[PDB]
Symmetry: D2
Amino acid sequence: GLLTDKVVVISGVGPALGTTLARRCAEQGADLVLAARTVERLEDVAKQVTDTGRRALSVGTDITDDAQVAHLVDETMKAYGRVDVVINNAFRVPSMKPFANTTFEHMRDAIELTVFGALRLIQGFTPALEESKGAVVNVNSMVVRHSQAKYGAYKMAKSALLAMSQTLATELGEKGIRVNSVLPGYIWGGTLKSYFEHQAGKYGTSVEDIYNAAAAGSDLKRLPTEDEVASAILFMASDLASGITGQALDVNCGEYKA
Amino acid sequence: GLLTDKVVVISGVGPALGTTLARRCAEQGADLVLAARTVERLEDVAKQVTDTGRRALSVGTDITDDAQVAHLVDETMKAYGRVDVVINNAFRVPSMKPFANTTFEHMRDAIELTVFGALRLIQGFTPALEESKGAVVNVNSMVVRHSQAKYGAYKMAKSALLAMSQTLATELGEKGIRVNSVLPGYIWGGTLKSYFEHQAGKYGTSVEDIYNAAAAGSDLKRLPTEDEVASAILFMASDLASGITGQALDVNCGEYKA
Amino acid sequence: GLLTDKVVVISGVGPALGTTLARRCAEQGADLVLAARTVERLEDVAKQVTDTGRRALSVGTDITDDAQVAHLVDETMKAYGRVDVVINNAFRVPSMKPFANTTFEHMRDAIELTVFGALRLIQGFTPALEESKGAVVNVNSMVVRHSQAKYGAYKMAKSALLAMSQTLATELGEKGIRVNSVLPGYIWGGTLKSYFEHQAGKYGTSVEDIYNAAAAGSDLKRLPTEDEVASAILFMASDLASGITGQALDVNCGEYKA
Amino acid sequence: GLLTDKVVVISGVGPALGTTLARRCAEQGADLVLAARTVERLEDVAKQVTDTGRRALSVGTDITDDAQVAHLVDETMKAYGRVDVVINNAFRVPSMKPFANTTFEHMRDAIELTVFGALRLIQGFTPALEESKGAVVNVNSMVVRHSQAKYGAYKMAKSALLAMSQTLATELGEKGIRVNSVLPGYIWGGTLKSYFEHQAGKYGTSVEDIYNAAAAGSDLKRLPTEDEVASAILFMASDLASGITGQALDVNCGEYKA
Ligand SMILES: [Cl-]
Ligand SMILES: [Cl-]
Ligand SMILES: [Cl-]
Ligand SMILES: [Cl-]
């Protein structure tokens, strides 16, 4: 029972880590608020939550919009009257392009969602988190640990997010609110597998070849799973981490070390 | 039950974090091996373990000595037949001296205990950890995050340990063995309180003054507790962290961020 | 003669570091392109350059505008026919506000100037830098080394810039173009002195008090001067640094170490 | 004239970087003290120095021995009466072995030379450096930026050295003494070429294959040269770097970024 009787808000619930996270939080005793633009996706996630016997509030939210984040906060406080944890899940799909071929509009949009969206959420729920002495976990990315070609827009936005997360730990720490980051690389599950299958066919190779190439830089020679990344997020969200704020915990089977 | 039916070896069991850690591992379902030079100290820790209903093997061990580490391994394998976790606890008491006034003998001894001792332990238990696909947690220190005057010998040894821990994650990762570090600053409990009381009298001030000065750089304006640092170590030792190796997790209430 | 017969473009020429930099580059044998929004400021800087016997091209440029950066490139290539160095000087004045009181518009504008402006410049001059196997120096900030309250918008933009600079080293390195950053804290000179004088009067203290407080975290107990920061930038721009790319060189008298 | 009328002590003068460094310092106007165990090697380096018209004092010194470092200091002060720069050059040849196969004696010896030797030198020359407000440059290594298998003993010693260098910047900064590090990877020149030739024959491949493999991780797809690493050291030793202390400057053509 890591999260018994806590309310956890997850923004950016997709079919992969987001769904695993919602399920895992519920298994650990949390009730959920699920936020995403497309509310049809939240329906099955909510079922996995309610199957554990917990509650799920699903709220269609564009976190780039002030009114919509205000509505999410209002609906949450109406349904539960409290928030213990806010998780900003990394939903936006990165495009591998060198900066030379990346549009400025794309990078502005990436910052809008990844940085300002997360800030809007955190700020919206600051009053709730002040009362609960709660925790924020921002899902970041291994991309901040390297400078590989074509990862620039993604590294830029994620780096701005990491920097913001760090300042927020300082600024919200006097209210007793913890703010940490979890930095996964590739995350193995059904979604990444389908993607590797597409890549395998498109490049005339095997999924094993693609998987092994992706995992080769790691110490363990395996990619972390959705559950393994979720476990790190749950730890940071929980009272096991009550002494921990301002930190980035990398979940990457050792590929980059910090 | 984070550590149900696991065997955990703790080296460097003292009255503070070490004792809390042993107790907490046992509460989470682990049986213990307790190693320290002074075996009289292990007696009360073993009682806290056996009070939870688990088992404790106490073995007097100078981890700077090959024969004594070999004996610890032999006694552990005779008693339990397996090891899932090795924790190298930071026992050695640092002396605040500028390098100019630090003896070379002191620094050699610090490296001997903090670095080579930990390596000797890890190597001794590598065969056991290979079979269990186990985990190593090395307790390091916040000192590696700054360069403050008089912390040099301590930062040097701890930095060498961190570097070694990182290489060990690479080298032992192919055997499926995880290696991580936990980096606490000051750790609040009975031991640190007595120390602050001594300092308070010796400098004509209050414990509150000393505590608040120590905590002022943190985001949360509190020092982490023995339990909070223990929780981080338990997480890293557990299967919740099965996707995590080569990492340093700082438990410092935000004073330094990484 | 560090920069003999090289052409150096400086964007963001202000009264402080920018003016010192232009003068110093010219003293080292460079001809200059000076770019800023307000062209009246470029007049006196150009005189300091031409007093050394070198040439200065002054071009009013809003580096947030595609057409204006295109014009700067065209005018430079018309006047000099080459570019060896591009320096993106940190001009924008940060406002100390917690994130909670910072407008999203302000942060978008900070990113626009500090990040996208610098990228636009670098991209505009990529063809020139390819031919010269030239160098880019982005002036960043000590703020990326800490998470102090009220520095958030500034740290966010500067961090995004640092991340971008690092990826650009990878992406432009195959064309033989070097990209490095110089990270100053406070920079002592006439401009910062006037500012400390304002602060001194407004807080009822001395300039010495303010200066000493600002310098207290440093190892040397002094702030770096405009010349000292300029020297670091000149080194990185020069062939002395031909083995160096992707690096951040902090000029802060030891306050933060990397 | 970066070092006009300065006295530069170089410890660990070998046939590669050390010889290039001595020559380059002399070309920039410095007089030299050359220290190494084997004094026969110092003879040709001293000739390259005196060919520039400067002076070279050659002193056979085991920097692991107190009396011998005391003698080096005494001979230097007798010959020149001052020291402006101390450079601890990385001489010791690393053995690629996993920790499991590395003897403790080897690692103690590596620390003795790389860490304690450098400290002994710095301390011996502290009185001289106090008077000159001088500078220390410790030649470190790219190995501190990664955790690759078999580099453990080398990373451990170099990491301890980096940590020590950082504390020394704090501790000696109040005397106005600067302390920085230069972190090269492979360094191209006659010595490394012979080594690649040996490897080429022993593995049945070309020097080009070996060179290109070594350079593949870099941004520039070339290894830094002895001159390029020397240039970085000269910069850090010089008054161009008078605002810079406590810093590590990586000279690696972009392979690792900090
Ligand atoms: Cl998702
Ligand atoms: Cl203890
Ligand atoms: Cl300026
Ligand atoms: Cl050498």
